[PDB]
Write a protein that binds this ligand. Structure first.
Ligand code: HEM
Length: 439
């Protein structure tokens, strides 16, 4: 049955959503009943509800994706697998996204961001930030996932992913003239492309032309579980498809918005500049940014977090009750759906005083003063974001090189709105800015 799916969809595109939950909390409370995407759903608002859903994976709940997302991502990815297979895939992914592993890719990421800024920003009087950020974010994935530096090949894959992403928000009608149908065709083309990259990679590894750690493709190809089993081609394809979905639209949001919010709060921009320039003062010219420099960008990371609080790229996500669960006096029946949202804590004065104000100081001392399960841009528990530290690296390096290159900037439209009907919140006009390069 339609249930409340239509009203929820209406509120989502309306870019409100907070109200959708607010009025249901006002009428029923934090733990209330609803029907979404044809399933009986219970929304658990607030920190206590967040802990229930997020911290009890495989105990009381399991990740549940809607049918259409399963068809576009595949059934063999880390996001669509459960139980033991999920834990193995996270272990394989940790070989690239883990803190020790991520440090070996900072050089490649730094170089691309540096080259992108110099080529497409440094010499312009004005730029439209959003398309540049999208290009940079995708190209970093192409380099770090597949070692693809060829610009035409990067653009080809970039266009293909855009077509697939259209279907994830269209009506799931697999018919010749619908958006979902074209997305499914795009996924088929991408699968064939990635299959050829897998084959050539297997050869390149056997002939000593590629290493086991150079990129994500090699890490996943060389992974073996505790019993010596490698991942299958379908598992590698679906994981790459899922990782492209997860990485492109999400990271684009804070990167595109960070300098919009900073332009409205110049005192915070002043502190970002001072932090970044102080880091450069202690380096010789030509010396590359290091992982140690990265960890010194504390205030910059506080600005990024406050951007994520006010404009979460992922409003929330769904689980399925794998057992009858007793919560707040009620019993969520097995087979029912559960939903948590950042909108129950992120915009609330109760958890973040003056929530409408941009205050990076909320995350002072590495977030010491943030209450548990109130700031959740990357979720939590066994299903927490695989790539959050990858995103953090991109944002910090991007901010660093921008501040290094430019003395100042000025928004062309200071009153530009920040909407997103599709999940990703972004500058409504792409955030055009005038640029002032350092002399
Ligand atoms: C850029 C690289 C990124 C990669 C490779 C990535 C990858 C992933 C993957 C594979 C998962 C599923 C983990 C699992 O099922 O075990 C996940 C979860 C998640 N991601 Fe990310 N992600 C990235 C960036 C981001 C960003 C920037 C945000 C938001 C600021 C974000 C928000 C989330 C959230 C909230 C979840 C958990 C959803 C839930 O538990 O219901 N991701 N990510």
């Amino acid at each position: 049955f339609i249930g409340e799916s239509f009203i929820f969809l209406r509120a989502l595109r309306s870019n409100s959503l907070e109200q959708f939950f607010d009025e249901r909390v006002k009428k029923f409370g934090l733990v209330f009943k609803t029907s979404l995407i044809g399933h009986p759903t219970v929304v658990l608002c607030g920190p206590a509800g967040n802990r229930l859903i997020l911290s009890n994976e495989e105990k009381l709940v399991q990740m549940s994706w809607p049918a259409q997302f399963m068809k576009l991502m595949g059934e063999n990815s880390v996001a669509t697998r459960r139980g033991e297979d999920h834990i193995v895939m996270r272990s394989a992914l940790a070989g690239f996204f883990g803190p020790g592993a991520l440090q070996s890719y900072i050089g490649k990421m730094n170089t691309e961001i540096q080259s992108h800024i110099n080529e497409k920003w440094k010499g312009k009087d004005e730029v439209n930030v959003l398309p540049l950020v999208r290009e940079l974010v995708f190209n970093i994935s192409a380099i770090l996932f597949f070692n693809i530096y060829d610009k035409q090949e990067q653009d080809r894959l970039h266009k293909l992913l855009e077509t697939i992403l259209v279907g994830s928000f269209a009506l799931p009608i697999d018919l010749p003239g619908f958006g979902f149908h074209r997305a499914l065709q795009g996924r088929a083309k991408l699968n064939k492309i990635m299959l050829s990259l897998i084959k050539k990679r297997k050869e390149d590894l056997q002939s000593g032309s590629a290493t086991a750690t150079q990129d994500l493709l090699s890490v996943l190809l060389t992974f073996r579980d505790d019993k010596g089993t490698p991942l299958t081609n379908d598992e590698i394809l679906d994981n790459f498809s899922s990782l492209l979905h997860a990485s492109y639209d999400t990271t684009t949001s804070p990167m595109a918005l960070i300098f919009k919010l900073l332009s409205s709060n110049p005192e915070c921009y002043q502190k970002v500049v001072q932090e970044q320039l102080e880091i450069l003062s202690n380096k010789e010219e030509g010396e590359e940014i290091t992982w140690k420099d990265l960890k010194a960008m504390k205030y910059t990371w506080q600005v990024a977090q406050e951007t994520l609080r006010m404009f979460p790229p992922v409003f929330g996500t769904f689980r399925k009750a794998i057992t009858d669960i007793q919560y707040d006096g009620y019993t969520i029946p097995k087979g029912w759906k559960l939903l948590w949202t950042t909108y129950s804590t992120h915009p609330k004065d109760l958890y973040f005083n003056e929530p409408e104000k941009f205050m990076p100081s909320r995350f002072d001392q590495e977030g010491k003063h943030v209450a548990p399960y109130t700031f959740l841009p990357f979720g939590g528990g066994q299903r927490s974001c695989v790539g959050w530290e990858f995103s953090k690296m991109e944002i910090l390096l991007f901010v660093h090189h921008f501040v290094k290159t430019f003395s100042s900037y000025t928004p062309v439209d200071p009153d530009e709105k920040i909407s997103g009907d599709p999940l990703p919140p972004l500058p409504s006009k792409g955030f055009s800015i005038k640029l002032f390069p350092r002399p």
